Design a protein around this ligand. Structure first.
Ligand SMILES: [Cl-]
Ligand SMILES: [Cl-]
Ligand SMILES: [Cl-]
Ligand SMILES: [Mg+2]
Ligand SMILES: [Mg+2]
Ligand SMILES: [Mg+2]
Ligand SMILES: [Mg+2]
Ligand SMILES: [Mg+2]
Ligand SMILES: [Mg+2]
Ligand SMILES: [Mg+2]
Lengths: 203, 148, 189, 99
RNA sequence: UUGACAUUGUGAAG
RNA sequence: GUUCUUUGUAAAGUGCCUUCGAAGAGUCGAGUUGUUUGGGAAUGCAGCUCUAAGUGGGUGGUAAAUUCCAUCUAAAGCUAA
RNA sequence: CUUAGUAACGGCGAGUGAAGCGGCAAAAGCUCAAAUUUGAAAUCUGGUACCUUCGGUGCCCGAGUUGUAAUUUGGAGAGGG
């Protein structure tokens, strides 16, 4: 079908056709609220491969997030400590802007579950994202065998605990020697390696 | 047990064995290996030469399994044969009936020649061997077979 | 804090280690609960042996490659050579691994023999529901043990061709060292 | 591909009887198909060329392929990706005006 | 505070 | 263990021949800054800039050019002990 | 459990410091996107009447072709014979 063409055309972001479309759309988004409902996905092909379905119970929201670093919120720049901790301006937030977008949408619609999100646009000040949401109370979802797993109480506020795709990337949840510190949770690994184990018959 | 310690003997002696002049303070001289080059230099230069500095070249991601090679000397070679069979082979030193010893199956990597073996032909299978070890095996009528 | 002739110590206790001390007081308690769990599981699951059939594989690394052990599961080719499908094998008590490959004929033949022996020593009750009563054997690994393959006979004849084993190792080591330079020297001419 | 049978050398290791496993379909992941080649060619004629791709075409014609590879390395990442991009631009040049 | 890049498009001349 | 329904010109598995075999983009990757790691010409994470490919791509613990080999299949998801 | 206070990091000072293999406990596997059902949107929320009521049937609006079912997830698999 047409989904194959959409995937390949989306990759030519600096072509003349897409540069025109991204300029007119970035203006339209900026005129709306920071968070607002979207009637339909602007990238239907991208939504499908992230788990979106065109049925009642699936919701799309659009959100813009300020770009740049994270200035340390200290009064007048004083840190009251050793010079190794006196940095103020060149500090970076450990979670991505995509993660921040999902969190604020999640609080706005607390009756829904965050599934995934994707990049749509950006400018000098903002990055724009569209978040995919699933209603766990709708009977179309609770009776759907492929999606009723999200109705379980263990999946409440996935984006808050970093259980989404962007959350697992920032947690370093991968396999291999490159992720020894964060294979199964950084803090749990630190607890295991800093625990003194004593048996009844001392070894 | 606490009843056999010198603490029980020091009861009623004021200083508890630490002296009146010097006393028992918290950390006179520092903590741990502090002052190893300034006020503990003499105790480091003797009893521990070579502590300060670096010598060789680094090796990133060292795996100790690559260097596994236990050594076996010829004076211990016949211990690999079970004791109930050593006597018959020793007294039946001959060709076409030479016992076969799998050194790798016993968990050794290289054969070294230190002692003296009986003048009996033996078939020795190993991954590595020293030059002297092979000569003594052949001098007794045996052979060395390389395996992997 | 350095005095006398004593070894250098490296005790790592400069953190809040007393907050993370784990004493295994319940070692005896956990053993009882594990035995209770195995007893309850066996009575509940089926008269089946409570564990799946495992293949025989060669241990990796030059340090351990002299021994065989129990692997994850039988390969798709090994399962196919035994005369059944992978989907049916999983429901009959045979572990199946899809990512292990077959490169050695001796390991492949040994694993196929295990599957053939296993099929001849089990009774598959029909789905009809009759299920004639049978005694439960608690272990399938003990029923089919893994044995180290034999390597050589106890005694043979001495066969010396005059070449030194030490000399052979030295030549093989030297020839590998200078292979690259000799190819370059021959390439330039 | 036969090992020597001794613990050291080029083809060191024990000799065992060899088997060839069936090829795994996952080893052909990056293989072009008839459908995918049709789509990519059609999208190329629709979308046109990127601004940096136009600069590489100018450099090839006026300054030579060697310098275009140097510029392509800076825009792209590795040096091996520069070769593929410069080679791709040559095919575009050979058909745009040369034929 | 100063420079570079991004935001950043359209027309002409020296 | 018994008992009421036949689900169904339904569903599933297996042999041989031929043609095919769609597999995730501001993402991978690169530069730079900060932080972090035992990871040391840079372990992971994040900001900004640049920005891919399809016999391709990642990895192979010393930076680079050239020729091979080995091993997996990222950028979507669920799951008891 | 061990590897191991080891490889490595560190005014290479004070100090810091994993991982592969090996034995064991427990063991379980999997599914979406990307394909024309096209001789038939075959899919679903809700309303309403009734019934054998953690639901079912009939009827009626609505959702949905800017894609809801069946079929296939790389171990493969699919269209024909
Ligand atoms: Cl998905
Ligand atoms: Cl006394
Ligand atoms: Cl560095
Ligand atoms: Mg006194
Ligand atoms: Mg006193
Ligand atoms: Mg004193
Ligand atoms: Mg004094
Ligand atoms: Mg921090
Ligand atoms: Mg999960
Ligand atoms: Mg630390």
């Amino acid at each position: 079908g047409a989904y194959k063409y959409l995937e390949e055309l989306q990759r030519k972001k600096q072509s003349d056709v897409l540069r025109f479309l991204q300029r007119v759309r970035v203006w339209e988004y900026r005129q709306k609220n920071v968070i607002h409902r979207a009637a339909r996905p602007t990238r239907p092909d991208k939504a499908r491969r992230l788990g979106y379905k065109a049925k009642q119970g699936f919701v799309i929201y659009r959100v813009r997030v300020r770009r740049g670093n994270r200035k340390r919120p200290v009064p007048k720049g004083a840190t009251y400590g050793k010079p190794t901790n006196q940095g103020v301006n060149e500090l970076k937030y450990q979670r991505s802007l995509r993660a921040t977008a999902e969190e604020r949408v999640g609080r706005r619609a607390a009756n829904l579950r965050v599934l995934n999100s994707y990049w749509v646009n950006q400018d000098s000040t903002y990055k724009y994202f569209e978040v995919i949401l699933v209603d766990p109370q709708h009977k179309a979802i609770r009776r759907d065998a492929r999606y009723n797993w999200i109705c379980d109480p263990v999946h409440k506020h996935r984006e808050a605990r970093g259980l989404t795709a962007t959350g697992k990337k920032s947690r370093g949840i991968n396999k291999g020697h490159k992720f020894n510190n964060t294979k199964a949770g950084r803090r749990k690994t630190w607890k295991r390696q800093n625990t003194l184990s004593l048996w009844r018959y001392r070894k | 047990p606490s009843r056999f310690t010198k603490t029980r003997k020091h009861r009623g002696h004021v200083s508890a064995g630490k002296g009146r002049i010097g006393k028992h303070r918290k950390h006179p001289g520092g903590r741990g290996m502090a002052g190893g080059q300034h006020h503990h230099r003499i105790n480091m230069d003797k009893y521990h030469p070579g502590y300060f500095g670096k010598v060789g070249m680094r090796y990133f991601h060292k795996q100790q399994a690559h260097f596994w090679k236990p050594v076996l000397n010829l004076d211990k070679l016949w211990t690999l044969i079970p004791e109930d069979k050593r006597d018959q082979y020793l007294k039946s030193a001959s060709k076409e009936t030479a016992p076969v010893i799998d050194t790798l199956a016993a968990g050794y990597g290289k054969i070294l020649g230190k002692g003296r073996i009986p003048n009996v032909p033996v078939i020795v299978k190993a991954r590595f061997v020293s030059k002297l070890a092979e000569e003594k095996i052949r001098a007794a009528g045996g052979v060395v077979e390389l395996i992997a | 804090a350095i005095s006398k002739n004593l070894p250098i110590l490296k005790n790592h206790f400069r953190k809040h280690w007393q907050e993370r001390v784990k004493v295994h007081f319940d070692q005896a308690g956990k053993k009882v609960s594990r035995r209770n769990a195995r007893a309850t599981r066996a009575a509940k699951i089926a008269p089946r042996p409570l564990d799946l059939l495992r293949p025989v594989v060669r241990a990796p690394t030059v340090k351990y490659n002299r021994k065989v052990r129990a692997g994850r599961g039988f390969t798709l080719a090994e399962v196919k050579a035994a005369g059944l499908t992978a989907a049916y094998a999983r429901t009959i008590g045979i572990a199946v691994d899809h990512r292990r490959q077959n490169r050695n004929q001796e390991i492949f033949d040994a694993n196929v023999q295990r599957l053939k022996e296993y099929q001849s020593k089990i009774i598959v009750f029909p789905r009809n529901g009759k299920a004639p009563e049978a005694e439960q054997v608690l272990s399938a690994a003990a029923t089919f043990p893994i044995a180290q393959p034999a390597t050589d006979v106890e005694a043979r004849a001495v066969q010396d061709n005059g070449e030194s084993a030490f000399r052979t190792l030295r030549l093989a080591r030297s020839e590998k060292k200078f292979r690259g330079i000799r190819e370059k020297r021959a390439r330039e001419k | 591909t036969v090992k020597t049978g001794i613990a050291i050398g080029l083809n060191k290791g024990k000799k065992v009887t060899s088997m060839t496993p069936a090829p795994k379909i996952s080893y052909k992941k990056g293989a072009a198909s008839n459908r995918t080649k049709f789509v990519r060619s059609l999208v190329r004629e629709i979308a046109g060329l990127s601004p940096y791709e136009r600069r590489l075409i100018d450099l090839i014609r006026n300054s030579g392929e060697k310098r275009a590879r140097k510029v392509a390395k800076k825009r792209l990442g590795s040096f091996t990706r520069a070769k593929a991009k410069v080679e791709e631009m040559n095919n575009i040049i050979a058909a745009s005006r040369r034929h």
